[PDB]
């Protein structure tokens, strides 16, 4: 179980164990039945050092899960600024669309993460991006009560 142990170690922050698998030849791009790669669970759990190790070894920064969610999506939903920046500096697509048009900017605007929205805009997030429901991130921000976040989105015109 070289792969299945890698994903389990990536979550809950078993940095030593992740290092052990990857030094023993484990596939850093392994997938589970949900399409999640070890980078996905490392980012979604707020584990910065493990994310850096996986990226330095050669993990797919733009890996898509079963519904097109990238590690950037899972980092944005928890509002982890460092991991977002690390992924963006390592080639993560800032405007990556999932299977239904949801971008990391969309998720950041809906969940109410001002810093994540600002950083994504700084790295080139598309304000005019429309999901399968025809909603721009400004629409989500003004929908979910995130008005101050919708201020920055409107400023980017």
């Amino acid at each position: 179980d070289l792969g299945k142990k890698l994903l389990e170690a990536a979550r809950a922050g078993q940095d030593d164990e992740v290092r052990i698998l990857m030094a023993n030849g484990a596939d850093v791009n392994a997938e589970d039945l949900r399409g999640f790669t070890p980078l996905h669970l490392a980012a979604n759990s707020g584990h910065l050092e493990i994310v850096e190790v996986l990226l330095k070894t050669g993990a797919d920064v733009n890996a898509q899960d079963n519904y097109g969610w990238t590690p950037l999506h899972l980092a944005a939903v928890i509002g982890h600024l460092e991991i977002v920046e690390v992924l963006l500096k390592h080639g993560a697509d800032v405007n990556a669309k999932d299977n239904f048009g949801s971008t990391p900017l969309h998720l950041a605007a809906r969940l109410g993460h001002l810093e994540i929205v600002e950083v994504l805009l700084k790295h080139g997030a598309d304000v005019n991006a429309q999901d399968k429901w025809g909603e721009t991130p400004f629409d989500l921000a003004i929908d979910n009560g995130n008005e101050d976040i919708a201020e920055v989105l409107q400023k980017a015109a």
Binding site: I78, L111, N144
Partner: protein, 75 residues
Amino acid sequence: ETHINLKVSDGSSEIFFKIKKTTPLRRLMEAFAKRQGKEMDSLRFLYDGIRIQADQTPEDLDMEDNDIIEAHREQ
């Protein structure tokens, strides 16, 4: 201290979210559902076995850190 981390699982997909404790749960309900392309109302969400209303807030449910929200397909 002001925000909360919550895990949403349907037995198949488990995802962590971080939201304000003073904001409605709706965002968390929608982003999880719309990832699969489903509407929020096409999914029942349970905290301690009790349906979560969209307008409810984490502080209304006495939610703690690393809490778990169960998701089940409706109909």
